[PDB]
Design a protein around this ligand. Structure first.
Ligand SMILES: CCCCCCCC/C=C\CCCCCCCC(=O)O[C@@H](COC(=O)CCCCCCCCCCCCCCC)COP(=O)([O-])OCC[N+](C)(C)C
Ligand SMILES: *[C@@H]1O[C@H](CO)[C@@H](O[C@@H]2O[C@H](CO)[C@@H](O)[C@H](O)[C@H]2NC(C)=O)[C@H](O)[C@H]1NC(C)=O
Ligand SMILES: O=S1(=O)NCN(C2CC2)c2ccc(F)cc21
Lengths: 51, 101, 50
């Protein structure tokens, strides 16, 4: 990796939701749902080199 | 409706709707950009323009946290980590090695 | 919480429970939980391995 960055639900400048989205992301991450959704989409065909 | 879409950031937005409690209208951004301050005058494009102008409430999309976007909108705290990396073809040849023995 | 501090510059990992009582900044280092264990002591094939 060249740098380290990250995504994020963008809210307008001073919205009251960014302190409620932050809670509702940290809740999903400890429950393992942010990994459960990523394994549902980013897998696809698990390409081998098989040979 | 909202039933037109699928994917990661649609399944994320369902889970944010269940926990916090709201209804949501997923609207495609009209520009097709995300955010870019045009250096000739200074103006935003895409989603970051539609959050400064308060035409949106959330921006659930691959909207990477950068230094310049954070001074004009407020991001949440990351739902996915990453970095810039090089994409290139696999080399489809084999090393001959005639002295392989 | 008792306002005896202003910053908490330390390895204070962002968790769900700490975020509801204090406000973190946005991460200066990324990580995860991982297993620490000894290396297996290695191979040492003898010189009379044949
Ligand atoms: C199919 C082809 C067969 C052909 C020959 C068959 C004949 C019999 C052949 C070999 C018989 C050897 C006995 C078996 C030993 C068992 C293993 C052992 O103990 O290893 C010991 C090795 O230390 C040695 O014992 C080395 C001795 C080599 C013998 C020389 C071969 C015969 C010479 C030519 C004969 C013709 C001469 C012409 C007329 C004079 C040490 O144990 P280790 O833990 O395994 O070592 C690792 C530890 N370390 C690294 C610190 C050391
Ligand atoms: C695996 O390696 C460890 C690390 O060396 C071995 O344990 C000790 O090794 C030190 C080396 O400085 C000795 O001073 C100690 O006396 C060793 N402890 C003992 C012998 O109880 C360990 O023996 C190795 N184990 C295996 C199965 O290879
Ligand atoms: O853009 S951030 O919010 N802050 C910067 N960093 C760490 C410095 C690498 C990271 C590291 C991982 C992320 F997911 C997000 C960020």
């Amino acid at each position: 990796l060249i740098d380290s960055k990250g995504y994020g639900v963008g809210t307008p400048m001073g919205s009251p939701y960014r302190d409620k989205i932050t809670i509702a992301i940290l809740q999903l991450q400890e429950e393992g749902k942010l990994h459960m959704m990523k394994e549902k989409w980013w897998r696809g065909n698990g390409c081998p080199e098989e040979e | 409706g909202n039933d037109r879409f699928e994917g990661y950031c649609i399944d994320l937005l369902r889970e944010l709707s269940t926990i916090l409690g709201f209804t949501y209208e997923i609207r495609l951004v009209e520009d097709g950009k995300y955010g870019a301050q045009d250096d000739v005058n200074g103006q935003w494009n895409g989603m970051v323009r539609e959050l400064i102008d308060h035409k949106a409430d959330l921006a659930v999309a691959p909207l990477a946290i950068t230094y310049v976007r954070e001074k004009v909108i407020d991001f949440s705290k990351p739902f996915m980590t990453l970095g810039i990396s090089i994409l290139y073809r696999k080399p489809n040849g084999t090393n001959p090695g005639v002295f392989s023995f």
